[PDB]
Amino acid sequence: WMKLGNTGAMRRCVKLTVALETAECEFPPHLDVYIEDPHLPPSLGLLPGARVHFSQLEKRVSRSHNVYCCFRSSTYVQVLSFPPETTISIPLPHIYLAELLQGGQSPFQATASCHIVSVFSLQLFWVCAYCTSICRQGKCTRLGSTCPTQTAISQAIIRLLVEDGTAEAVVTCRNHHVAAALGLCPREWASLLDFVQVPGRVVLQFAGPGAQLESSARVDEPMTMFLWTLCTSPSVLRPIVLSFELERKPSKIVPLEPPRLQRFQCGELPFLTHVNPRLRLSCLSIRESEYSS
Amino acid sequence: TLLKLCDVQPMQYFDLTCQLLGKAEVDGASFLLKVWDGTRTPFPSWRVLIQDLVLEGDLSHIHRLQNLTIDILVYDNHVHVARSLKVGSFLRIYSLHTKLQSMNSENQTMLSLEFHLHGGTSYGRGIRVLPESNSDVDQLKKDLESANLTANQHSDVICQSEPDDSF
Amino acid sequence: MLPKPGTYYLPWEVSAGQVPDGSTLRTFGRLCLYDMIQSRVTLMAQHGSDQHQVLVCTKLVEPFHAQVGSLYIVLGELQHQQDRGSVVKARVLTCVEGMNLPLLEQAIREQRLYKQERG
Amino acid sequence: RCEEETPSLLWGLDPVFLAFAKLYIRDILDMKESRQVPGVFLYNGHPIKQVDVLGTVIGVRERDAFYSYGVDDSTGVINCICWKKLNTESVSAAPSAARELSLTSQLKKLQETIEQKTKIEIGDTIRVRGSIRTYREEREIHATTYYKVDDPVWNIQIARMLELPTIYRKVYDQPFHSSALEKEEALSNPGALDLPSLTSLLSEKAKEFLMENRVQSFYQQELEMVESLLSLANQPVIHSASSDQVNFKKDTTSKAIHSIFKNAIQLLQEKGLVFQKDDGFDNLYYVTREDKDLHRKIHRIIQQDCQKPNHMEKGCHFLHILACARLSIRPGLSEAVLQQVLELLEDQSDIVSTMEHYYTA
Numbered sequence: 001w002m003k004l005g006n007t008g009a010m011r012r013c014v015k016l017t018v019a020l021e022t023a024e025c026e027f028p029p030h031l032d033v034y035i036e037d038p039h040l041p042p043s044l045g046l047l048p049g050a051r052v053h054f055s056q057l058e059k060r061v062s063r064s065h066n067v068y069c070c071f072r073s074s075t076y077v078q079v080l081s082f083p084p085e086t087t088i089s090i091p092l093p094h095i096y097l098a099e100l101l102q103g104g105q106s107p108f109q110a111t112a113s114c115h116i117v118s119v120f121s122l123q124l125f126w127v128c129a130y131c132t133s134i135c136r137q138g139k140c141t142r143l144g145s146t147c148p149t150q151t152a153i154s155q156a157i158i159r160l161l162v163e164d165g166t167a168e169a170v171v172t173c174r175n176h177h178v179a180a181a182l183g184l185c186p187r188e189w190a191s192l193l194d195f196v197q198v199p200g201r202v203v204l205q206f207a208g209p210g211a212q213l214e215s216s217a218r219v220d221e222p223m224t225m226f227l228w229t230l231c232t233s234p235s236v237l238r239p240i241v242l243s244f245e246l247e248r249k250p251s252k253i254v255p256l257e258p259p260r261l262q263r264f265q266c267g268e269l270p271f272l273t274h275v276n277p278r279l280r281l282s283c284l285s286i287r288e289s290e291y292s293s
Numbered sequence: 294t295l296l297k298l299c300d301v302q303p304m305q306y307f308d309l310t311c312q313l314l315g316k317a318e319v320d321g322a323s324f325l326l327k328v329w330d331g332t333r334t335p336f337p338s339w340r341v342l343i344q345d346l347v348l349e350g351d352l353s354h355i356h357r358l359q360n361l362t363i364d365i366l367v368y369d370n371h372v373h374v375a376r377s378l379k380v381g382s383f384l385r386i387y388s389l390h391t392k393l394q395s396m397n398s399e400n401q402t403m404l405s406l407e408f409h410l411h412g413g414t415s416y417g418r419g420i421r422v423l424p425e426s427n428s429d430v431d432q433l434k435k436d437l438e439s440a441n442l443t444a445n446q447h448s449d450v451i452c453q454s455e456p457d458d459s460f
Numbered sequence: 461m462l463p464k465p466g467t468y469y470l471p472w473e474v475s476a477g478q479v480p481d482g483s484t485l486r487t488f489g490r491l492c493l494y495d496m497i498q499s500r501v502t503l504m505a506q507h508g509s510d511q512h513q514v515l516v517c518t519k520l521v522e523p524f525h526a527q528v529g530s531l532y533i534v535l536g537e538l539q540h541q542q543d544r545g546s547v548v549k550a551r552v553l554t555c556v557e558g559m560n561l562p563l564l565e566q567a568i569r570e571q572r573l574y575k576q577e578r579g
Numbered sequence: 580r581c582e583e584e585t586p587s588l589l590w591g592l593d594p595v596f597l598a599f600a601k602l603y604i605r606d607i608l609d610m611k612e613s614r615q616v617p618g619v620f621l622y623n624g625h626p627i628k629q630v631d632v633l634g635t636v637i638g639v640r641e642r643d644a645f646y647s648y649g650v651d652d653s654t655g656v657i658n659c660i661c662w663k664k665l666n667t668e669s670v671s672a673a674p675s676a677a678r679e680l681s682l683t684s685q686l687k688k689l690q691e692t693i694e695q696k697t698k699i700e701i702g703d704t705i706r707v708r709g710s711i712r713t714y715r716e717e718r719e720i721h722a723t724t725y726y727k728v729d730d731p732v733w734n735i736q737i738a739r740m741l742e743l744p745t746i747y748r749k750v751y752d753q754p755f756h757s758s759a760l761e762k763e764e765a766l767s768n769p770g771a772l773d774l775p776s777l778t779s780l781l782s783e784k785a786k787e788f789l790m791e792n793r794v795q796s797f798y799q800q801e802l803e804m805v806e807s808l809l810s811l812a813n814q815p816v817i818h819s820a821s822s823d824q825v826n827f828k829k830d831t832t833s834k835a836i837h838s839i840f841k842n843a844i845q846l847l848q849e850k851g852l853v854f855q856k857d858d859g860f861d862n863l864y865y866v867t868r869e870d871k872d873l874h875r876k877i878h879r880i881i882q883q884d885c886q887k888p889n890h891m892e893k894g895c896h897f898l899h900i901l902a903c904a905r906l907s908i909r910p911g912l913s914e915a916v917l918q919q920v921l922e923l924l925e926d927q928s929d930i931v932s933t934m935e936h937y938y939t940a
């Protein structure tokens with residue numbers, strides 16, 4: 001704070017996420033609004049669910065090409081309605097993944113009745129609660145360097161292929177969701193995490209559907225054996241109902257490039273084809289459906 | 294022509310305008326300005342081995358900018374101007390030399406990008422304290438503000454109860 | 461050879477003899493009884509009606525432990541016998557319970573309606 | 580007929596080319612194979628390479644390497660070929676510590692129940708995800724995955740029945756791929772009329788041939804000799820330009836063709852496809868697309884974090900990666916081939932860019 005302006009300790013900055021209202025799109029794009037410190041505390045009535053007219057906002061873009069808006073000396077705010085007394089149980093829409101390959105006018109968030117094809121990679125960690133670096137069995141490497149005390153927290157990242165009969169997409173699934181992505185009972189997932197705390201880190205990286213483990217990991221450890229066998233078994237590769245975000249914020253600003261060439265090899269015939277870049281989806285929840293196998 | 298600290302390349306001379314963070318003596322014939330322009334350095338930024346560690350500036354926050362901070366070494370005639378500058382000043386440099394390391398004193402190969410303003414105003418070398426009226430300074434301050442807000446870095450002040458605002 | 465497909469027929473279509481005798485079929489109904497001495501049986505079903513029978517052979521393809529009143533799916537052929545009429549020579553016979561039979565009938569309706577809509 | 584014939588080389592712009600399309604078995608029997616290149620099939624202009632079918636087993640024959648299941652799905656019946664797999668090199672049981680007991684018993688439990696899911700009997704409800712083959716006028720499915728479907732209530736079968744019409748109407752009965760269809764209409768095909776243009780076309784055909792035949796490295800003569808590439812290098816412009824030495828047309832023209840092939844490979848170098856190791860073979864070239872070792876070592880710069888930063892800077896910058904690679908691999912490593920390798924790995928997803936010229940695994 002106060003890197004150039006002298007207003008040090010002028011209360012903490014505040015960040016609003018808002019759903020735009022317009023008739024120009026069937027789906028309202030979400031947006032971030034930053035209230036930098038000289039305006040604090042904010043106006044009354046800026047609460048979840050409150051419909052608000054924001055006027056004279058400064059539009060701004062990051063170096064990473066993310067659009068976000070910020071208050072200025074002319075920014076003026078006007079609440080139009082109060083929060084509702086009861087939260088609306090809005091279910092997300094259900095669409096086939098082919099709908100997202102159409103580009104614009106496709107929803108930001110959705111559910112899909114897809115089927116897990118294979119698992120690309122899988123990482124488990126235990127990191128220190130006060131500082132984001134690995135902490136095997138609670139042995140913090142940052143101890144004393146800002147880190148006041150040693151205690152550890154688990155973290156997990158997994159990457160999946162999902163396909164629903166119309167299109168195939170790469171799902172990046174993180175933390176508590178993976179326990180459902182693999183389908184373990186909370187007890188068994190807890191036990192697995194508790195064991196892997198001994199080495200503190202487990203990394204796997206697969207050569208593809210049904211293929212062998214890649215040299216980033218080794219056949220020696222029985223841990224890796226158990227995990228690899230599971231991640232290629234019909235116990236994971238199963239039907240689901242996914243709910244996801246399109247990995248890129250809903251906007252027209254995205255860069256673009258032509259469809260790439262890929263050289264398939266099917267039936268001993270070389271196929272050379274133009275092909276789209278794969279969808280990338282961020283998981284929101286995994287659930288079994290109809291207990292299908 | 295403007296060029297940013299994220300654009301720099303291994304063996305060059307540049308402007309690289311920035312905001313001054315701190316200062317210190319280095320030698321009877323060299324002096325330190327610690328600076329940033331808000332953009333991410335491509336190589337790990339250079340750090341000056343120095344005669345005393347108590348620099349001028351609000352070091353208790355300057356150290357939190359680490360990856361975006363850069364140490365600038367100015368040699369001869371430029372020093373008596375540098376020694377007078379105030380903390381947090383907006384600053385322009387002329388013909389600042391840029392030099393990539395590839396080795397350390399233990400004969401391990403490691404990469405970091407040095408910055409030098411060698412003696413004499415030859416080849417246009419010098420410095421210029423920027424006034425807040427020019428849109429270049431507005432752009433510098435604006436890039437700093439943007440890099441502060443849409444930062445996405447790990448949060449400092451882990452003892453989150455410390456501030457109490459203007460208590 | 462592969463057997464010709466056992467397409468779904470409702471008990472009323474065998475009752476009306478709309479499915480030709482000797483053809484492959486699949487059908488449903490609540491196993492009304494279990495004649496083991498002659499390996500003959502009935503699979504009662506009602507659809508806005510009184511229950512109507514469904515004679516089906518059952519000597520080998522499945523010595524099922526399930527009981528009367530349970531619902532069953534049967535697949536195979538049907539052929540005429542003078543006394544017994546048309547009787548189902550089951551190639552598969554299996555039990556089911558809790559099945560939403562009205563929804564199953566609607567599903568058959570949708571399937572055949574789409575087949576119609578398909579050129 | 581003009582719309583029923585295979586568009587393009589059935590390029591993968593249509594998303595169902597990468598999907599286990601959920602067709603009716605009878606439609607599998609109605610498919611038309613692609614006459615331009617066999618092995619894939621057509622429905623309503625959609626190219627279909629893989630399918631997902633659900634039905635019941637009504638016929639069985641076991642061979643050495645595979646089971647053959649006759650699967651019925653009301654509309655039709657088809658043979659499914661299922662490769663067998665043994666639980667080879669299974670782990671021994673022992674009275675080990677609680678953690679090892681856990682891992683071993685869990686591995687065996689998973690194995691047991693996977694076999695329980697996989698072993699099949701007559702009358703089973705079955706799902707198969709696979710691809711089509713045709714032989715001796717028979718048509719069959721090769722299974723990539725298959726498993727028994729346990730259903731005491733027939734509800735999933737009913738759901739399948741209800742579902743398929745809707746997805747057909749929404750997708751498969753859509754009679755179009757509707758790409759941009761950027762057809763060049765073979766303009767200037769018979770004659771480039773320009774030496775740089777002909778060189779560019781030669782480079783394009785060269786990369787096509789190279790990745791068609793999975794060429795990892797080649798001496799230039801081994802590519803110059805390709806009869807189709809020669810049938811392109813023999814266009815009139817270069818011949819006429821070479822013909823000035825009327826008494827030595829063969830020599831001048833052969834040298835000019837060698838030169839234009841070297842120029843095409845130079846274009847591919849400047850665009851980052853091929854490179855030369857330090858080997859003394861002045862006209863031997865290696866392709867980035869196939870140097871697995873270079874990929875791996877690059878991957879060890881950011882899968883295994885960059886070693887030089889003292890701060891834990893998540894990933895690494897393009898130039899920092901390039902300097903590290905030049906110091907650890909090859910000082911002459913071109914930025915073009917490194918960019919190509921990074922973009923390739925990102926296509927694989929072995930790497931992901933966080934921002935412009937910054938990457939992390």
Ligand SMILES: [Zn+2]
Pocket residue numbers: 128129130131140141142143147148149150151
């Ligand atoms: Zn710690």
